[PDB]
Amino acid sequence: MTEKAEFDIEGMTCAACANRIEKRLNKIEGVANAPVNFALETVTVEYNPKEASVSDLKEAVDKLGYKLKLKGEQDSIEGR
């Protein structure tokens, strides 16, 4: 089952910022994966909406400093 969720990240000026998110994300219970993509400025989070939630991990990202918001939820990304 699981779900894919796609989010736009603002402030992660270094790859270490991004990696720190991945670290936090991994620390959330019932996450599958969540590699942060340093080009499109987006992360594709994969998890189950049972033990974790988009809103929860949002706060977990905000906890690190940089901002996060919705982007999509079907391996799509979108942009110009």
Give me the least distance between CB of 64 and Cu ion, in Å please: 9
Q: Which span (11-19, 31-39, 45-53, 62-70) binds Cu ion, by CB under 5 A?
A: 11-19
What interhelical angle do 15-27 and 54-64 show, nearest 10?
Answer: 140
Q: Which span (15-23, 26-34, 59-67, 70-78) binds Cu ion, by CB under 5 A?
A: 15-23
Contact flag: residue 17 with Cu ion (CB under 5 A): yes
User: 2 a known binding residue?
Assistant: no
Give me the least distance between CB of 49 and Cu ion, in Å please: 29
